[PDB]
Amino acid sequence: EHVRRDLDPNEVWEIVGELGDGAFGKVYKAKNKETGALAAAKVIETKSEEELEDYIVEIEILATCDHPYIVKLLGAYYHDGKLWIMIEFCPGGAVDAIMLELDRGLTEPQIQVVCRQMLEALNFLHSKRIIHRDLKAGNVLMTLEGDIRLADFGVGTPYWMAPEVVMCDYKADIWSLGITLIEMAQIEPPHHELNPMRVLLKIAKSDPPTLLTPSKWSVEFRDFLKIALDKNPETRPSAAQLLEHPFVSSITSNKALRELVAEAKAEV
Numbered sequence: 001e002h003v004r005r006d007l008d009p010n011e012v013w014e015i016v017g018e019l020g021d022g023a024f025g026k027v028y029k030a031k032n033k034e035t036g037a038l039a040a041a042k043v044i045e046t047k048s049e050e051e052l053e054d055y056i057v058e059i060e061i062l063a064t065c066d067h068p069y070i071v072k073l074l075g076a077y078y079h080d081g082k083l084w085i086m087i088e089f090c091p092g093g094a095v096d097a098i099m100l101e102l103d104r105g106l107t108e109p110q111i112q113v114v115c116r117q118m119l120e121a122l123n124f125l126h127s128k129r130i131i132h133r134d135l136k137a138g139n140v141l142m143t144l145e146g147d148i149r150l151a152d153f154g155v156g157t158p159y160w161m162a163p164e165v166v167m168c169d170y171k172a173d174i175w176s177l178g179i180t181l182i183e184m185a186q187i188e189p190p191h192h193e194l195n196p197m198r199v200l201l202k203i204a205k206s207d208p209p210t211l212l213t214p215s216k217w218s219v220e221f222r223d224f225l226k227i228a229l230d231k232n233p234e235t236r237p238s239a240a241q242l243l244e245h246p247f248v249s250s251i252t253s254n255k256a257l258r259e260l261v262a263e264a265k266a267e268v
Ligand SMILES: COc1ccc2cc(-c3c(-c4ccncc4)nc(-c4ccc(S(C)(=O)=O)cc4C)n3C)ccc2c1
Pocket: 019, 020, 021, 022, 027, 028, 040, 041, 042, 085, 086, 087, 088, 089, 090, 091, 093, 094, 096, 097, 098, 100, 138, 139, 141, 151, 152, 153, 154
């Protein structure tokens, strides 16, 4: 249903500005002409027909995800050789972008929240037989309320990649969670220093990576990191399992986040 064809998205949406620039395009901000809703948009000019035919399934999936911690899709359109996709506006921005804005990493209370919610959001997906395949700071979004919104942004280096997936199975995401934590914890992920080539290999021969300044953080955090960053996919735990861990089982309030977001709304 949700993918319209032979309607110009400019008839339903105005573009009021840009947000940055990635790799399969720029990020646009957009205002629903008739209903007022703000959106973030993504345009994709396609070479092939299958290329497109494939993204159309991606999207109809996102359509069946009604969760409080996953972005909602607000409309999608093929028109004049291009394909636009309109996601819920999250005015706290992406997490990575905050760290870069504040020039710093997250505190533990703040990581705790983000993790808590990513876990709840993952559990949902895996329970719908769905993999995300692409967890990172950059796909974790923010409301002012201080809730996350998990975002796909497409389905180019991959530090958050799992071991079993190299050089070349829900459990892959969980690994990528673990890295993202470290990412938020240190702005940059492990092996940032390296060449995209050598990362892959580095992730393979390397022991599970740990935190850079270990006595800066709790037992609960690392004990959580350690058990999530299992290189065997089999002995690596599920979403729900991790949700029972103390690091996140205690977490009821997003204040820590929320205040972070508010800070960034002032530095801007
Ligand atoms: C498949 O449809 C889409 C369309 C637009 C998308 C935009 C983003 C996004 C958004 C976003 C911002 C506000 N509300 C929603 C999203 N922000 C970013 C983003 C992420 C990182 C950075 S940064 C400073 O680290 O270069 C900047 C932006 C704008 N992305 C990739 C993320 C996923 C998106 C997905």
